[PDB]
Amino acid sequence: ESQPDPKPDELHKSSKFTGLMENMKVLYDDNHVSAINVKSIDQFLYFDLIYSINYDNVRVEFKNKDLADKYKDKYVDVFGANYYYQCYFSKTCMYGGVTEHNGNQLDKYRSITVRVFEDGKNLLSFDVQTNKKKVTAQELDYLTRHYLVKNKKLYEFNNSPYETGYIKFIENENSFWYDMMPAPGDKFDQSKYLMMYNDNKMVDSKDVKIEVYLTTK
Amino acid sequence: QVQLVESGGGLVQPGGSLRLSCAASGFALSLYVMSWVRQAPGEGREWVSSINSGGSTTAYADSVKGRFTISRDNAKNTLYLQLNSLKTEDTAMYYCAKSKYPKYVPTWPPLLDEHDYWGQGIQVTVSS
């Protein structure tokens, strides 16, 4: 089935987050994990895999054992938004971001044109690019937000110019979306936020459309 | 291995200007808030200034605000401090300090104890 689009007061409001939006911003700045054609070299818990990506140990956490079992010792590409603070390990941590390398490579990059709406109105479109036939939503989300942070100040040091935001992925009939804003209160926990990626959700890079819906204050 | 090496600084008359430079190696500067702290004779460490990883946000101690400017160049892995309108009270060893927390900012401005590496330091003297 397709995910119902956000309800009236379902989306997090940035004005109700009173901590430093910097802690969200830094997740969608230049720093990120990207590795091509690598295989796991260790494992901590039964739902993670450790990769060597100088080389750092990257702990990739999945939602369950089935996903870790699937990719253990398979040659993959890894792409995602990593964190350090309270990274539990025994170095950096991330969730998901894993795609089989073999059979998934494109000769030429595919472009996906993000459509950006502000209060319902399309003011901006821009392309993200990938070499992958099947690509994680995480990778596409990161690339989309990276552009919006640089160019639209999506996240600033203290807060955002936007009250709400969600990113919507559409593949033919089916769609799903992520809330782009922090939960309310004075703390932002990066590990909790990023866990949304632990399902390793994948989309087809030819068919997927990306729509971002922002509201202003 | 993590290294911070301060250079520049020096001796100047009151009202003058100096510049400090810190070359970072063994880590990516871009992951870290960076700070300048100083230690004047017979004093404890004093926080002077901080800059976030991006470069968009700077903070200064009251005593130096409007006179000093912190900046960074992540590509060159360097932190800078411009010291203008110097006063005798500014005489001190100056140290470049790295946040203990990659990709995370618990407090702004940062606390002195939220740094975990320092260089050997560079002398600034405003000669009386």
Residue A201 to residue A134: CA distance in whole angstroms: 10
From B30, B56, B104, residue closest to A23, measured CB to CB = B104
Residue A203 and residue A169 in contact, taking contact as beta carbons nearer than 8 Å = yes
Using alpha carbons, select from B53, B49, B99, B47 the residue that is nearest to residue B72.
Answer: B53
What one-letter code names the amino acid at A124?
A: L
Residue A185 to residue A19: CA distance in whole angstroms: 7
Q: How far, CA to CA in Å, does B41 sit from each of B14, B45, B123? A: 18, 10, 11
Q: Which domains does chain B have, with CATH numbers?
A: 3-102+109-121 (2.60.40.10)
- Tokens representing B100 are 């203990």
What is the Cβ-side half-sphere exposure of residue B7, based on CA atoms within 13 angstroms?
6
| Residue A34 CB coordination number (10 Å) | 12
From A20, A31, A157, residue closest to B103, measured CB to CB = A31
Q: What is the resolution of this structure in A?
A: 1.6
Residue A75 to residue A98: CA distance in whole angstroms: 10
What does A19-58 look like in DSSP terms, one character per residue?
S-THHHHGGGSS--EEEEEE---B-SSTTEEEEE----EE
Omega before B41 within 30 of 0, i.e. cis:
no
Q: Where are the alpha helices (DSSP H) in B1-128?
A: none
Q: What does the domain layout of chain A look like in residue ranges?
A: 14-29+103-216, 33-100
Residue given tokens 């800059």 in the structure block: B51
- Please, which residues have CB within 8 angstroms of residue A9's CB and are 6 or more apart in sequence? none
Q: How do the residues of chain A divide into helix, strand and coil, expressed in percent and rounded to 5?
A: 20, 40, 40
CATH topology of domain A33-100: OB fold (Dihydrolipoamide Acetyltransferase, E2P) (2.40.50)
Element (H, E) at B18: strand B18-25
Using alpha carbons, select from B5, B3, B8, B12 the residue that is nearest to residue B81.
Answer: B8
- Experimental determination approach used: X-ray
Using alpha carbons, select from B119, B122, B95 the residue that is nearest to residue B4.
Answer: B119
Q: How do the residues of chain B divide into helix, strand and coil, expressed in percent and rounded to 5?
A: 5, 50, 45
How buried is B84 (Cβ within 10 angstroms: 0-12 exposed, 13-18 middle, 19+ buried)? middle
Distance in Å, alpha carbon of A77 to nearest chain B alpha carbon: 23
By C-alpha distance, the chain B residue nearest A187 is B106
By C-alpha distance, the chain A residue nearest B103 is A26
Establish if A23 touches chain B: CB-CB under 8 angstroms. yes
Residue A64 to residue A45: CA distance in whole angstroms: 10
In three-state secondary structure terms, B107 is coil
- Tokens representing A43 are 């494992």
CATH number given to A14-29+103-216: 3.10.20.120
Residue A186 to residue A17: CA distance in whole angstroms: 6
Q: How far, CA to CA in Å, does A135 sit from each of A95, A122, A146, B46? A: 14, 25, 17, 49
Distance in Å, alpha carbon of A198 to nearest chain B alpha carbon: 20
B103 contacts on A by Cβ (under 8 Å)? 26-27, 31, 82-85, 190
Q: Mark yes or no for CB contact A156/B28 under 8 Å.
A: no
Report DSSP state, residue A119: T
Q: How far, CA to CA in Å, does B89 sit from each of A60, B6, B95, B126? A: 51, 20, 16, 8
Establish if B49 touches chain A: CB-CB under 8 angstroms. no
In three-state secondary structure terms, A16 is helix
Dihedral sign for Cα A87, A93, A94, A95, please.
Answer: negative
